[PDB]
């Protein structure tokens, strides 16, 4: 979707708040640390999220004002809740009451519970990862060195086809192989693998200005089309 998250090329966001790495703190609040666990915990078990595709769409669906105002880990919370509701893991009214409860008395303690069984599962995910590489029988359409042209399409659902590179000419730099197709996997429509390519674009083609700059990006075969003659 052409949402607020696709900020590539926009103006008005001001200067970068640069900070020294030895002073840039990871988590400032405890709920932020909690969120990371909540995210990694569910995805490891496949609760509401098999991989990161279903995770990114949840964020993209946020209201523009919430996306810009909530903190970074606010995005993570929104998607985890989105996915757990969607997949029916948790009930709408069920979550609303708890949220309100914790807004009333934030100091409320939670019953601690543990079991090394799940912990072992989470570790498996953190160390083995979730490679989106798959095997297909299709023959890739383009080859390294070939001049390509991104398609002019505006999908309504999730997509990794940023607006600043649509309807533009580029050159294939590499053929990675076949990877899970975001546009489908994110909407639970089946991970329908597609050849992934790294395409190089010149600043002139993207911004209409001759500068010695270039952008490299990975695009799925479904986003590209051959150059007409």
Q: 129 to 158, contacts with a copy of itself by CB under 8 A? A: 151-154, 156
From the list 85-93, 98-106, 175-183, 207-215, the region that binds a copy of itself by CB under 8 A is 207-215
DSSP output for 173-201: EEEEEEE--HHHHTTTS----EEEEEEEE
Of residues 56 and 179, the one with the C-beta less far from a copy of itself:
56
Residue 147 in contact with residue 171, Cβ under 8 Å?
yes
Closest approach of a copy of itself to the CB of residue 153, in Å:
5
Query: Does 14 contact a copy of itself by CB under 8 A?
Result: yes
**Count of other CB atoms within 10 angstroms of residue 42:** 18
Radius of gyration of the chain (CA): 21
**Residue 151 binds which entry of a copy of itself, other proteins, none, with Cβ cut-offs from 5 to 8 Å by kind?**
a copy of itself
- Long-range CB pairs of 115-124 (<8 Å, 24+ gap) are 118/41, 118/45, 121/44, 121/45, 122/40, 122/41, 122/44, 124/44
Among other proteins, a copy of itself, none, the one that 152 touches (CB under a kind-dependent 5 to 8 A) is a copy of itself
Q: Give the residue with the Cβ less far from other proteins, 112 or 229.
A: 112
Sign of CA dihedral 220, 222, 228, 229: positive
Angle at 57 between CA 51 and CA 60, to 5 degrees: 145
What gap in Å lies between CA 86 and CA 80, rounded to an integer?
Answer: 10
Binding mask 44-83 for a copy of itself (x = CB under 8 A): ----------------xxxxxx--xx--------------
Q: How many residues bind other proteins (CB under 8 A)?
A: 105
Smallest gap from residue 9 Cβ to a copy of itself (A): 6
Which of a copy of itself, other proteins, none interacts with 208 (beta carbon under 5 to 8 A by kind)? a copy of itself
- Residue nearer to other proteins on the CB measure, 16 or 228: 16
Contact assessment for residue 140 and residue 226, using Cβ atoms and an 8 Å cutoff: no
Number of residues forming the site for a copy of itself (CB under 8 A): 28
Residues that bind a copy of itself (CB under 8 A): 1-4, 9-14, 60-65, 68-69, 151-154, 156, 167-168, 207-209
């Amino acid at each position: 979707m052409n949402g607020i998250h696709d900020v590539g090329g926009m103006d008005g966001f001001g200067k970068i708040m640069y900070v020294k790495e030895e002073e840039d703190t990871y988590f400032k609040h405890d709920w932020e640390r909690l969120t990371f666990g909540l995210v990694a915990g569910c995805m490891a078990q496949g609760l509401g999220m098999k991989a990161f595709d279903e995770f990114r769409i949840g964020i993209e669906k946020m209201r523009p004002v919430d996306y810009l105002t909530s903190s970074y880990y606010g995005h993570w919370i929104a998607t985890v809740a989105y996915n757990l509701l969607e997949t029916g893991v948790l009930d709408e009214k069920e979550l609303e009451d708890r949220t309100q409860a914790f807004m009333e008395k934030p100091d409320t303690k939670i019953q601690r519970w543990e079991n090394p069984k799940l912990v072992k599962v989470v570790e498996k995910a953190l160390l083995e990862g979730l490679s989106p590489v798959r095997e297909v029988s299709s023959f890739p359409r383009f080859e390294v060195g070939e001049r390509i042209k991104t398609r002019n399409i505006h999908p309504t659902g999730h997509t990794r086809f940023p607006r600043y590179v649509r309807d533009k000419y580029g050159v294939i730099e590499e053929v990675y192989g076949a990877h899970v197709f975001p546009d489908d996997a994110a909407h639970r429509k089946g991970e329908n693998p597609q050849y992934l390519y790294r395409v190089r674009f010149d600043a002139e083609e993207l911004w209409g200005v001759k500068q010695n700059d270039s952008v490299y990006i990975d695009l799925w075969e479904g986003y590209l089309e051959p150059v007409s003659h």
